[PDB]
Amino acid sequence: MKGTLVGTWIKTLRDLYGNDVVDESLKSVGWEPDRVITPLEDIDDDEVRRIFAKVSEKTGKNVNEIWREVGRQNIKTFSEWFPSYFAGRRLVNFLMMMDEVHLQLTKMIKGATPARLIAKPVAKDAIEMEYVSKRKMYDYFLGLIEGSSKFFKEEISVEEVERGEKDGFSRLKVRIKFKNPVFEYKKN
Amino acid sequence: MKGTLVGTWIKTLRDLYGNDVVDESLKSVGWEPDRVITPLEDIDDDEVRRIFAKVSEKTGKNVNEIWREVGRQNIKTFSEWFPSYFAGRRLVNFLMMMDEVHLQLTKMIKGATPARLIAKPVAKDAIEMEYVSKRKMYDYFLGLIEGSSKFFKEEISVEEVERGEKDGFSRLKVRIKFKNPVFEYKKN
Ligand code: HEM
Ligand code: HEM
Ligand SMILES: [Cl-]
């Protein structure tokens, strides 16, 4: 994972579980307890795994729950570090533009296999959003959606439609329903 | 020199002088014209120098001018590879955060005395910025400032105040003036 996101995860873990737990978890994988991860770095995904496993150990929460909580709270971290993505927007357009935003952030990467966050209207008050990747961050994804709702103070209902791994390509499809009609048939 | 930085320079050189100049300059130092530099690699400062010397020879431009133009164009390259440093920012904040950003980038390096890019307000509409290093990349520094102005679409006036060497440490201090007031006296 590119250092840009990993840096936010570290801060977010601190907001959730405290500096003590995070310092100890970082040290447990050989990092300096106050390591600042930058955009120029590429963090080994298995190192991230072990950090999260230590947090699970110290907090007594299942790692799935930790990812959910991190997703939820990481939205606030994003809003502080990169307020530009939030300013002058409402939830529906925010979710709608996530795919584009991530494509911009991943346009340069070596992997050449872009995770996708395609959203599309399926009713006057609902979208389907599909997470497609090789990494299978199911709980993180669900958490980010909740965190978005929380941040924008707009209530939604989320129903999981599909989740499964095909050829390494993990997919998670959700239906998100809003409190007000937001879409209408126009002529393709 | 950090491999990833040299990577940006190679791309920037292609944008400025064409693939032919660069491919041949790379070959002249025994590289593959299409070499991929890892985020963990460093490149010897001397090889960088010889590459630049070849570019100067082929283009017929003084190498000082090449560095100036590379600095100018490299901001664009940085903004493409590392968008998060640029998203939603304005020029003043960007320049003021460079010292910290650079300190975060070369903490791993065995350099027990790092290059510095300290900036400080000296008036409501102006900062002094001082580049201090052993490397004497004067023209690159001035170029990057100009590229920053261009990128953020904020006009500035740059006055070089001092430039010179001492203790093996070269230093270049400029005064940068903005078109309107950006600082003001604040408690403590
Ligand atoms: C301003 C808001 C956001 C920013 C700045 C942001 C930024 C990022 C960045 C930099 C990455 C790393 C991509 C890479 O280098 O591989 C990433 C990954 C990811 N983003 Fe976000 N994100 C935002 C909001 C969201 C939201 C709202 C969702 C879902 C609703 C989301 C879902 C994901 C997921 C699931 C990953 C991991 C994808 C993978 O498996 O590679 N993000 N994000
Ligand atoms: C996001 C934008 C930027 C990034 C990612 C970046 C990154 C880097 C990196 C990785 C180095 C290598 C340090 C080393 O190997 O010793 C470096 C050096 C340098 N940077 Fe930047 N830089 C950025 C913008 C700027 C700006 C705006 C300036 C000037 C205002 C600047 C001035 C310099 C100078 C003068 C050096 C050479 C330092 C020395 O003598 O050792 N950089 N930068
Ligand atoms: Cl649980």
- Whether residues A82 and B85 touch (CB distance < 8 A) is answered with no
Tokens of B145: 């400032």
What whole-number distance in Å separates Cα of residue B81 and Cα of residue B15?
Answer: 14
Give phi and psi for B141, each to the nearest 5. -55, -55
Burial B128-152 (b: 16+ CB within 10 A, else e): bbbbbbeeebbbbbbbbbbbbbebb
| Cα B34 to ligand 3 centroid, rounded to whole Å | 49
Residue-number span of the structural domain to which A175 is assigned: 1-188
Minimum distance, in Å, between the CA of residue A84 and any CA atom of chain B: 5
First vs last C-alpha separation in chain A? 38
B87–chain A Cβ distance below 8 A for any pair: yes
What whole-number distance in Å separates Cα of residue B181 and Cα of residue A54?
Answer: 49
Tokens of A36: 């600042």
Task: Give the orientation angle of helix B63-81 with respect to helix B45-59, to 10 degrees.
Answer: 110
Residues B11/B36, Cβ–Cβ less than 8 Å = no
β-partners of residue B1 are none
Minimum distance, in Å, between the CA of residue A179 and any CA atom of chain B: 30
Ligand closest to A59 (CA) is: 3
What whole-number distance in Å separates Cα of residue A101 and Cα of residue B118?
Answer: 32
Tell me the three state secondary structure of residue B14. helix
Q: How far from the centroid of its chain's Cα atoms is residue A170's Cα?
A: 15
Residues B104/A32, Cβ–Cβ less than 8 Å = no
Put residue A88 in one of left, alpha, beta given phi > 0 → left and psi -120 to 50 → alpha. left
How many residues make up chain B in this entry? 188
Q: How far from the centroid of its chain's Cα atoms is residue B84's Cα?
A: 17
Residues A78/A9, Cβ–Cβ less than 8 Å = no
Task: State the DSSP code for A41.
Answer: -
Residues B95/B148, Cβ–Cβ less than 8 Å = yes
**How many domains would you assign to chain A?**
1
Of ligand 2's listed atoms, the one at least distance from the Cα of B111 is: 16
Pocket of ligand 2 (CB under 6 A): B 1-2, 5, 78, 82, 85, 95, 98, 102, 105-106, 115, 117, 131, 133, 135, 137, 140-141, 144-145, 148
CA-to-CA dists, residue A145 to A66, A70, A126, B56, B97, angstroms: 15, 11, 14, 52, 31
Instruction: Quickly tell me which residue has 């873990």 as its tokens.
Output: A13
Max Cα separation, chain A?
57
What whole-number distance in Å separates Cα of residue B168 and Cα of residue B155?
Answer: 34
Max Cα separation, chain B?
58
Residues B2/B105, Cβ–Cβ less than 8 Å = yes
What whole-number distance in Å separates Cα of residue A39 and Cα of residue B167?
Answer: 33
Tell me the three state secondary structure of residue A2. strand
- With 0-12 / 13-18 / 19 or more C-beta atoms within 10 angstroms meaning exposed / middle / buried, residue B95 is buried
Give phi and psi for A86, each to the nearest 5. -110, -30
Task: State the DSSP code for B82.
Answer: -
β-partners of residue B173 are B130, B162
Residue of B nearest to A8 (CA): B84
Query: Closest Cα to residue A134, out of A174, A162, A168, A99?
Result: A168
Query: Closest Cα to residue B155, out of B134, B128, B131, B125?
Result: B125
Number of A/B CB contacts below 8 angstroms equals: 34
- Cα radius of gyration (chain A): 17
Could you give the residue ranges of the DSSP H alpha helices within A32-62?
Answer: 45-59
What CATH number is attached to the domain comprising B39?
3.90.1520.10
Count of H helices and E strands in chain A?
7, 4
Tell me the three state secondary structure of residue B146. helix
Residue A164: CA atoms inside 13 Å, Cβ hemisphere, count? 3
Tell me the three state secondary structure of residue B63. helix
The residues near B131 (Cβ < 8 Å, ≥ 6 apart) are B115, B116, B117, B137, B138, B141, B171, B172, B173
Query: Closest Cα to residue A152, out of A99, A101, A78, A102?
Result: A78
What whole-number distance in Å separates Cα of residue B113 and Cα of residue A113?
Answer: 40
Query: Closest Cα to residue A40, out of A100, A109, A107?
Result: A109
First vs last C-alpha separation in chain B? 39
Q: How is A81-138 classified by DSSP, letter by letter?
A: H-GGGTTT--HHHHHHTHHHHHHHHHTT-SS----EEEEEEEETTEEEEEEEESS--H
Ligand closest to A64 (CA) is: 3
Query: What residue ranges in B72-155 does DSSP mark as E strands?
Result: 119-123, 126-133
Resolution (angstroms) stands at 2.0
The residues near B88 (Cβ < 8 Å, ≥ 6 apart) are A82, A83, A84, A85, A87
Residues A83/A76, Cβ–Cβ less than 8 Å = no
Of ligand 1's listed atoms, the one at least distance from the Cα of A147 is: 27
Residues B170/B134, Cβ–Cβ less than 8 Å = yes
Method by which the model was determined = X-ray
Q: How many other β-carbons are positioned within 10 Å of the β-carbon of residue B112?
A: 5
